[PDB]
Amino acid sequence: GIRKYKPTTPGRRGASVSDFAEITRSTPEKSLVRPLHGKGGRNAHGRITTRHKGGGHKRAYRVIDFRRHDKDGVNAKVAHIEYDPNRTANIALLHYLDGEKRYIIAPQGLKQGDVIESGANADIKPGNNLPLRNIPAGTVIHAVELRPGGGAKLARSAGVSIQLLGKEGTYAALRMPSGEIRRVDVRCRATVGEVGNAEQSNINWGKAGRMRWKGKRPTVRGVVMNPVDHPHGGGEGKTSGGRHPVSPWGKPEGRTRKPNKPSDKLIVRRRRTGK
Partner RNA sequence: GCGCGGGUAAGACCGCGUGGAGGCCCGAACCCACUUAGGUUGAAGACUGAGGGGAUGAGCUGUGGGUAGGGGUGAAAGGCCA
Partner RNA sequence: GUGAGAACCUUGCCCGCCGAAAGACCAAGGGUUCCUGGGCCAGGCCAGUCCGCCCAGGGUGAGUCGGGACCUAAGGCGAGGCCGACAGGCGUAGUCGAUGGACAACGGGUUGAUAUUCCCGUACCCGUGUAUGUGCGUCCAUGAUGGUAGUCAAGCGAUGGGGUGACGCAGGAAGGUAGCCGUACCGGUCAGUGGUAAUACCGGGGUAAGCCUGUAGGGAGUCAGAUAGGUAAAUCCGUCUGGCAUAUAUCCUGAGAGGUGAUGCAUAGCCGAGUGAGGCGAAUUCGGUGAUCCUAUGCUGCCGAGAAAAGCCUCUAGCGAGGACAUACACGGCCCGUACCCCAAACCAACACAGGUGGUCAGGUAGAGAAUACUAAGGCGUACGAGUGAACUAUGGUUAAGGAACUCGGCAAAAUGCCCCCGUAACUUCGGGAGAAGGGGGACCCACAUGGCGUGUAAGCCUUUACGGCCCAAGCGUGAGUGGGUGGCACAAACCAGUGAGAAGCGACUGUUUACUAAAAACACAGGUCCGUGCGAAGUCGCAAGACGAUGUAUACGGACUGACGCCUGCCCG
Partner RNA sequence: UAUAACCAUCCUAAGGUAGCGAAAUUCCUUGUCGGGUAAGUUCCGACCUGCACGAAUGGCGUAACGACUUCUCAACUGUCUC
Partner RNA sequence: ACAACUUGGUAUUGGUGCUCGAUCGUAUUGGGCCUCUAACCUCGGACCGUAUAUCCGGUUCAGGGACAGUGCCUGGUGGGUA
Q: Which of residues 111-130 bind RNA (CB under 7 A)?
A: none
Measured distance between the N- and C-terminal CA atoms of the chain, rounded to whole angstroms? 31
Q: Could you say which of RNA, Mg ion, none residue 101 binds, taking C-beta under 5 to 8 angstroms by partner kind?
A: RNA
Q: Could you say which of Mg ion, RNA, none residue 109 binds, taking C-beta under 5 to 8 angstroms by partner kind?
A: none
List all residues 6 or more positions away from 268 whose beta carbon is below 8 Å from its beta carbon. Answer: 180, 181, 182, 183
Q: Is 24 in the site for RNA (CB under 7 A)?
A: no
Q: Is 11 in the site for Mg ion (CB under 5 A)?
A: yes
- Least distance in angstroms from the C-beta of 135 to Mg ion: 26
Provide the strand spans (E) within the chain. 2-4, 16-18, 33-34, 61-62, 76-82, 91-96, 101-105, 115-116, 129-131, 140-142, 162-168, 171-175, 181-185, 189-192
Q: Which of residues 230-259 bind Mg ion (CB under 5 A)?
A: 234-235, 237, 239-240, 244-246
| Alpha-helix residue ranges (DSSP H) falling in the chain | 208-212
How far apart CA 157 and CA 200 sit, in angstroms, is 10
Q: Is 219 in the site for RNA (CB under 7 A)?
A: yes
How far apart CA 164 and CA 61 sit, in angstroms, is 32
| Dihedral class, residue 73 (left if φ above 0, else alpha if ψ from -120 to 50, else beta) | left
Shorter beta-carbon distance to RNA: residue 166 or 275: 275
How far apart CA 33 and CA 41 sit, in angstroms, is 23
Q: Is 7 in the site for RNA (CB under 7 A)?
A: yes
CA-to-CA separations, 227 to 213, 239, 241, in angstroms, rounded: 32, 12, 9
Asked if 6 and 17 count as a contact pair (C-beta separation under 8 A), the reply is no
Q: By CB under 7 A, which span of 109-117, 118-126, 130-138, 195-203 interacts with RNA?
A: 195-203
Q: Is 249 in the site for RNA (CB under 7 A)?
A: yes
The closest alpha carbon to 270, from 141, 142, 178, 162, belongs to: 178
Q: Could you say which of RNA, Mg ion, none residue 20 binds, taking C-beta under 5 to 8 angstroms by partner kind?
A: RNA
Q: Which of residues 75-94 bind RNA (CB under 7 A)?
A: 77, 83, 85-89
Q: By CB under 5 A, which span of 27-35, 95-103, 148-156, 179-187 interacts with Mg ion?
A: 27-35
The number of residues that bind Mg ion (CB under 5 A) is 25
The residue from 1, 136, 169, 271 that contacts RNA (CB under 7 A) is: 271
The residue from 160, 164, 172, 174 that contacts RNA (CB under 7 A) is: 160
Neighbours of 69 (CB within 10 A): 14
Q: Could you say which of RNA, Mg ion, none residue 57 binds, taking C-beta under 5 to 8 angstroms by partner kind?
A: RNA
How far apart CA 87 and CA 84 sit, in angstroms, is 6
Q: Is 34 in the site for Mg ion (CB under 5 A)?
A: yes
The residue from 150, 173, 175, 186 that contacts RNA (CB under 7 A) is: 150
Q: Is 275 in the site for RNA (CB under 7 A)?
A: no
Shorter beta-carbon distance to RNA: residue 58 or 136: 58
